[PDB]
Amino acid sequence: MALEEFLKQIREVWNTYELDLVNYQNKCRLIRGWDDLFNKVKEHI
C-alpha cells in the first residue's frame, strides 16, 4: 500500500508543480528556483 502512495504522491506533485517565472526588465518571464526543482527531481528518482 506504500508504493501506490508514492506513485500517487509523485503524480500529484508533477501534476501541480509549476515553473517559477519572474519578470526580467519588462522583456521576459525568466525562471528561478533551480535548486528546489533539481532536488525534487533527484529525490523522486
Which positions lie near another protein, rule CB under 8 A?
14-15, 17-19, 21, 27-31, 37
CB of 36 to another protein, least distance (A): 12
Breaks (C-N over 2.5 A) in the chain follow: none
Joined grid coordinates for residue 21? 517565472
Task: Closer to another protein by CB, 4 or 18: give it.
Answer: 18
Q: How far is the CB of 37 from another protein (least distance, A)?
A: 8
Q: CA 32 to CA 20: how far, in whole Å?
A: 6
Residue pair 13/40 in contact by the 8 Å Cβ criterion: yes
Taking the complex as a whole, the smallest distance from the CB of residue 42 to another protein amounts, in Å, to 15
